[PDB]
Write a protein that binds this DNA or RNA. Structure first.
Ligand SMILES: [Mg+2]
Ligand SMILES: [Mg+2]
Ligand SMILES: [Mg+2]
Ligand SMILES: [Mg+2]
Ligand SMILES: [Mg+2]
Ligand SMILES: [Mg+2]
Ligand SMILES: [Mg+2]
Ligand SMILES: [Mg+2]
Ligand SMILES: [Mg+2]
Ligand SMILES: [Mg+2]
Ligand SMILES: [Mg+2]
Ligand SMILES: [Mg+2]
Ligand SMILES: [Mg+2]
Ligand SMILES: [Mg+2]
Ligand SMILES: [Mg+2]
Lengths: 149, 271, 104, 77
RNA sequence: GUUUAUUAAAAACACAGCACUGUGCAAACACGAAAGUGGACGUAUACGGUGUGACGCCUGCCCGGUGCCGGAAGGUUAAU
């Protein structure tokens, strides 16, 4: 299964690499997410004459946005009001969208598919680290304070 | 209350009632009743799939809120009512806003009590809250298997399920049959045991009591003819063969659990 | 009424909000005519033998005269608070007010 | 029913043969599966009850090539 | 109570019991080429199967055979 890469993907190489990978990794994952094009001869010279050079530009319009989503996300004092008890004893568990809602109100209008939690539940009221996946290269790190509402 | 009745007619000789004065001698709460037609153990094909079922007294379904979703609003127990459907007793309850529902009856529950489901519920028999908020070891019942699905565990009349271990997103549950099972730690469960614990103490007495409960007589196997059943035939009583189903499958001790989707949740099999 | 004495063993990783627990209990004590007599935090303290796979703790001693019903309420509060690990309820003869020698 | 909508593989019949050559009638069943497919021309998914053989065909011809055929066949998808 | 309508109505069958087992719920199981339905709008004090057949006193010994069940080192081993 030959396939050309629309973007650099880690364990197989950069953009513009006509690599033979397995079918399920190509068919179910790379293609529907649009990370790659199946290396058909109508798509070879469609890529190699045009999108071997067009996607060099089209990766820079995203890579310039990569430094934005952590530079402005360095305030780090994100406040989430949530009901709890004493020495913790949380009522409702802090979800990924809830962290994607207060940071939405201050900085990046951030999506539900951006909050990468090392912990997930965030039981104890207090500060909690929250990582972001705004691009596959650079990650934004914000230690969000949970506040006992 | 168990009562050995007196031997007036032979057929009253062994009848053991379960007397309860708590049972609301009235007609039940009509907006929570609905028709449950009988079936007689017959599918849409009209073949008798499961045997022995048929006849019996007419029964109307009671709508039991197993899912138990009114949260924050406390309840109050109006009265305890008999259920012809299930073995356990039910209780018409009432919330603050005005909705009446049926729930199951825990053992330590009488009329006029107040209960509440939620996450901030207190811990007394009758509350229902997700098991991450419940102390390990405390016996519960009415346990959901999937979050929000409605409790399918410890729902009979004299059951309960202990919470032996909590770790991460899972909790280990000692089932009533004694079978350690993981459940997700967001399933809700109702504290304490379940009411009619002496339901197993009854004795039906006469054969007609079996027929009132919709159960037809079970013919034993080796009475039949060899065309009818593997145990059939015999000049008199001959049974030189291994105890099998009517469909030939070995019965005494041959296991049948073929579900392999769910093996990662069974911590230990029963004993 | 019934002179009691309560000492209890708070998990030492919960030693930060112990006066949060003390004063709410003290309010729950004095909410029903609770004659507090001494209210003594002992801080972190090494265990003589490690309970529950750890070796430090947090101790608070408290003399209380109170009716018994709010105390049994408070007994269950220790039972489900996991900040406290062990508790003690001792029926005292009188209102002991003198500080312990191990306060020093 | 069991129709690989890309190819047309229908469950054909045959025989099970003993080593003593006692023939009994059986069927052969195609390895059909339901599978979504990222139709990029509309940027969405289309499910097809397709055998694994036709999965190689979409891997060879491309999905819009195959969807041209079923529009040409008129079979709804 | 039930049964051989029409040469047999009982000691036959059923039975309430009792015991074994299986069954964690999308249950086991059954009808189903299948979807599905019964199971059950029930959830192990439940359900299925098999045994004996109220109650009373009881229910001894044998796991060699045969099934069943568990253990996997090894030996054996299919397509591959
Ligand atoms: Mg049955
Ligand atoms: Mg029986
Ligand atoms: Mg019988
Ligand atoms: Mg016969
Ligand atoms: Mg036979
Ligand atoms: Mg004989
Ligand atoms: Mg022939
Ligand atoms: Mg007679
Ligand atoms: Mg008859
Ligand atoms: Mg006759
Ligand atoms: Mg007749
Ligand atoms: Mg006659
Ligand atoms: Mg079913
Ligand atoms: Mg018999
Ligand atoms: Mg073995």
């Amino acid at each position: 299964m030959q396939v050309i890469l629309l973007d650099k993907v880690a364990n197989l190489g950069s953009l513009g690499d006509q690599v033979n990978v397995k079918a399920g990794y190509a068919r179910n994952f790379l293609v529907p997410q649009g990370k790659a094009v199946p290396a058909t001869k109508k798509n070879i010279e469609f890529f190699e004459a045009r999108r071997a050079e067009l996607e060099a530009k089209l990766a820079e319009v995203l890579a310039a946005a990569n430094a934005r989503a952590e530079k402005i996300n360095a305030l780090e004092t994100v406040t989430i009001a949530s009901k709890a008890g004493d020495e913790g004893k949380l009522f409702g568990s802090i979800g990924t969208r809830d962290i994607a809602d207060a940071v939405t109100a201050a900085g990046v209008e951030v999506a539900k598919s951006e909050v990468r939690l090392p912990n997930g539940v965030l039981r104890t009221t207090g500060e909690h680290e929250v990582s972001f996946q705004v691009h596959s290269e650079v990650f934004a790190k914000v230690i969000v304070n949970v506040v006992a509402e | 209350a168990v009562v050995k009745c007196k031997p007036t007619s032979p057929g009253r000789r062994h009848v053991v009632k379960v007397v309860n004065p708590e049972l609301h001698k009235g007609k039940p709460f009509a907006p929570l009743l609905e028709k449950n037609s009988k079936s007689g153990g017959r599918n849409n094909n009209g073949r008798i799939t499961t045997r022995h079922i048929g006849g019996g007294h007419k029964q109307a379904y009671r709508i039991v809120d197993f899912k138990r979703n009114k949260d924050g609003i406390p309840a109050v127990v109006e009265r305890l009512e008999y259920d012809p459907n299930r073995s356990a007793n039910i209780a018409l309850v009432l919330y603050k806003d005005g909705e009446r529902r049926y729930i199951l009856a825990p053992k330590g529950l009488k009329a006029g009590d107040q209960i509440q489901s939620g996450v901030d519920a207190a811990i007394k028999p009758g509350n229902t809250l997700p098991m991450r908020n419940i102390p390990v070891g405390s016996t519960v019942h009415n346990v959901e298997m999937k979050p929000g699905k409605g409790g399918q565990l410890a729902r009979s009349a004299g059951t309960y399920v202990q919470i032996v271990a909590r770790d991460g997103a899972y909790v280990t549950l000692r089932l009533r049959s004694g079978e350690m099972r993981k459940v997700e730690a967001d399933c809700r469960a109702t504290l304490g045991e379940v009411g009619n614990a002496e339901h197993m103490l009854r004795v039906l007495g006469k054969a007609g009591a079996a027929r009132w409960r919709g159960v037809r007589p079970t013919v034993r196997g080796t009475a039949m003819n060899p065309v009818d059943h593997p145990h059939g035939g015999g000049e008199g009583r001959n049974f030189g063969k291994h105890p099998v189903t009517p469909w030939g499958v070995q019965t005494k001790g041959k296991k049948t659990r073929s579900n392999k989707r769910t093996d990662k949740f069974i911590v230990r099999r029963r004993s | 009424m019934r002179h009691y004495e309560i000492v209890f063993m708070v998990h030492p990783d919960q030693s930060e909000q112990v006066p949060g627990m003390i004063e709410r209990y003290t309010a729950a004590i004095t909410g029903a005519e609770g004659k507090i007599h001494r209210l003594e935090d002992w801080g972190r303290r090494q265990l003589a033998y490690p309970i529950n796979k750890l070796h430090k703790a947090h101790y608070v001693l408290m003399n209380v005269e109170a009716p018994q019903e709010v105390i049994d309420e408070l007994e269950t509060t220790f039972r489900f608070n996991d900040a406290v690990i062990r508790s003690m309820v001792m029926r005292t003869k009188h209102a002991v007010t003198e500080a312990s020698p191990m306060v020093k | 029913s069991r129709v690989c909508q890309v190819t047309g593989k229908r469950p054909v019949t045959g025989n099970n043969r003993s080593h003593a050559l006692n023939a009994t009638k059986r069927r052969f069943l195609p390895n059909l599966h339901s599978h979504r497919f990222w139709v990029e021309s509309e940027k969405r998914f289309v499910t097809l009850r397709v055998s694994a053989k036709g999965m190689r065909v979409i891997d060879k011809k491309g999905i819009d090539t195959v969807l041209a055929e079923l529009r040409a066949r008129g079979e709804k998808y």
